[PDB]
Structure 1
């Protein structure tokens, strides 16, 4: 199988729990699957121009017989590169922190590139239908406070954002590994983090 790892954090593992989690899942995945093709995409090593008018118009027009501007075609070429790589993968693993309630803006731009009629969803008379139902997806997230319960739960917009968009694209039975609360309950941080790394190992073995 071809497996794409999308890394959305360039902090060192020693300082960033989401990075420690991503690296553990990655190492465990490779150990269990020596003959898979595993590809890492580090969003901080890429040039990710923000989506705006030229990308919106270019991706709408592409393939429909319209003229494109040079700038529209440049924008389409960027989105196509990421979109085609994502579509080629049999499994996709996203590793990201919660920062300021949500995902890193680098990952927000990457997911914007994935939204394309005819590629990740199609229109029907009954509404949009997702086209990635055959892809296995894992979401690996770390967050300092607890967001699964308590007063912050209603403003969690990191895992919720990625799961909502992947669900729209048609992904089902996504796996999620979440390490939360290590900043909020610092006395238990070591055990909270270790427990997440164990869970990552178990999920990666079956993924």
Structure 2
């Protein structure tokens, strides 16, 4: 089986979500040693912003910049469709996801490729996947009205076919050492229950 890990924090080795993604990988390698794991760091190797020129590349001959972004989109969709387990690190910045992750989403969502229209609605074409979202927050938003990230991720992932999503939260990072420790400990325990399922 095949695991894809998508890192999206801008805080590099200080990132809470990267430390937790790295813990997931460690645990996965020990407990499922035959599985191949690919890590894509969307901050280290940024995906361009979706602009008018790029959306044209996805939807006459293309400019160099456009051909290249189509190629990238194809590469990213191919990689997603190639993996069985999708781990998405989704730190919350200003009540949204990171722009790093977003730009990835904007190249992956493509009609007739990752979803298609039917009579009874759109349906996703990325099938058979199990996702895990590792989402870190300075504050505490879980199950509250200020967490749009969680439902947005469920919505966006479901749209492209990924309806089996498990969320791992690391909240209250900003609230001192007991709380930041609690966040790590709680997230790791959640990861452990997933890895040993």
Cα distance in 2 between the residues matched to 1:178 and 1:47: 24
Asked whether the equivalents of residues 3 and 91 of structure 1 are also in contact (C-alpha less than 8 Å), the reply is yes
Unaligned runs of 5+ in 1: 61-66
TM-score for the superposition, normalised by structure 2: 0.90
1:109 and 2:108 equivalent?
Answer: no
1:83 Cα offset (Å): 1.6
Asked whether the equivalents of residues 114 and 160 of structure 2 are also in contact (C-alpha less than 8 Å), the reply is yes
1:118 and 2:112 equivalent?
Answer: yes
Cα distance in 1 between the residues matched to 2:56 and 2:150: 29
1:7 Cα offset (Å): 0.9
Cα distance in 2 between the residues matched to 1:45 and 1:16: 13
TM-score for the superposition, normalised by structure 1: 0.86
Asked whether the equivalents of residues 4 and 41 of structure 1 are also in contact (C-alpha less than 8 Å), the reply is yes
Counterparts in 2 of 1:1-207, with a 5 A limit? Answer: 1-13=1-13, 15-60=14-59, 67-70=60-63, 71-149=65-143, 153-184=144-175, 187-206=178-197
1:47 Cα offset (Å): 3.7
1:11 Cα offset (Å): 2.6
1:128 Cα offset (Å): 0.7
1:10 Cα offset (Å): 4.7
1:53 Cα offset (Å): 1.7
SS at match of 1:97: coil
CA RMSD of aligned residues (A): 1.9
SS at match of 2:43: helix
Q: Which deviates more, 37-46 or 192-201?
A: 192-201
| Deviation digits for residues 134-164 of structure 1 (CA, Å, limit 9, x no counterpart) | 1111111111111124xxx323232332221
Q: Which deviates more, 109-118 or 76-85?
A: 76-85
Unaligned runs of 5+ in 2: none
| Deviation digits for residues 163-189 of structure 1 (CA, Å, limit 9, x no counterpart) | 210011121221111111232465433
Asked whether the equivalents of residues 130 and 171 of structure 1 are also in contact (C-alpha less than 8 Å), the reply is yes
Cα distance in 2 between the residues matched to 1:146 and 1:199: 17
1:79 Cα offset (Å): 1.4
Cα distance in 2 between the residues matched to 1:48 and 1:191: 33
Aligned length: 196
